[PDB]
């Protein structure tokens, strides 16, 4: 705290309480005994624990019929109107678009829609497989996520 | 018809004005003005100015009947305190309060 290290008043003699600095935490304009510092909250996850959790997440997805595997998923143009036309015909509104090969033609079309997200097959995470209601697989992404989990 | 009439930020403590205000509670305006005329207090002329202001508001702003008009409710509420410093002996300071009050006078016909 920006201030002086001078003792406010005498140790004895005065009727006031014993004080040594105006920067004390029991004083106004300065305090906070255990002040926070910029720290790291990330905690270590074992490779077998992370891979084991993803396999258990994917195993529950097929038990809740939320995993929909398809042969291919690609739009002809980056327009979001025709992408929004696509998944509405298969009765999906809030899905996680995961494909084996991330194409910029599909990346641009799903950038504005809030309830969908496009990722690469190597870049999967647990939380998006849980937060999103449904999740759709293309044919070659299944063979790529199978070997990365093993 | 109530016709409230107050005087906020009166330069006097509420304790001194409550002594004067207790004299005219439940009295006719004719008798209350006569009582306040011969009362030798600073608050006596303070609340008399409010009372005649309350009487005039009871004839111009609304209603009538000045003679049949009774001071039903009267009270003095303390206002903000303006605080000064009185230099005392031994280099010490004693802080004084210039106490104010809100003299509210409401007078009706019944």
């Amino acid at each position: 705290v920006t201030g002086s290290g001078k003792k406010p008043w005498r140790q004895k003699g005065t009727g006031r309480a014993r004080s040594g600095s105006i920067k004390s935490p029991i004083w106004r304009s300065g305090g906070v005994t255990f002040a926070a510092r910029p720290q790291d909250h990330s905690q270590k996850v074992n490779k077998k624990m992370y891979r084991g959790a993803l396999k258990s997440i994917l195993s529950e997805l097929v038990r809740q019929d939320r995993l929909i595997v398809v042969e291919k998923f690609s739009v002809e143009a980056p327009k979001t109107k025709l992408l929004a036309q696509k998944l509405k015909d298969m009765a999906l509104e809030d899905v996680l678009i995961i494909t084996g090969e991330l194409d910029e033609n599909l990346f641009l079309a799903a950038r504005n829609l809030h309830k969908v997200d496009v990722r690469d097959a190597t870049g999967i995470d647990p939380v998006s497989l849980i937060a999103f209601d449904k999740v759709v697989m293309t044919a070659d992404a299944v063979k790529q996520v199978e070997e990365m989990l093993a | 018809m109530e016709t409230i009439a107050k005087h906020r930020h009166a330069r006097s403590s509420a304790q001194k004005v409550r002594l004067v205000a207790d004299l005219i509670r439940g009295k006719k305006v004719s008798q209350a003005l006569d009582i306040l005329t011969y009362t030798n207090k600073k608050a006596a002329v303070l609340v008399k100015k409010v009372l005649e202001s309350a009487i005039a508001n009871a004839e111009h702003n609304d209603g009538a009947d000045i003679d049949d008009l009774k001071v039903t409710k009267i009270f003095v509420d303390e206002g903000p305190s303006m605080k000064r410093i009185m230099p005392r002996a031994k280099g010490r300071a004693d802080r004084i309060l210039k106490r104010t009050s809100h003299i509210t006078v409401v007078v009706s016909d019944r």
Partner: peptide, 15 residues
């Protein structure tokens, strides 16, 4: 806000 002159001390004794 100043302190006080402190109470005048008495003559301290010894053994």
């Amino acid at each position: 806000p100043r302190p006080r002159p402190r109470p005048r001390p008495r003559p301290r004794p010894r053994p």
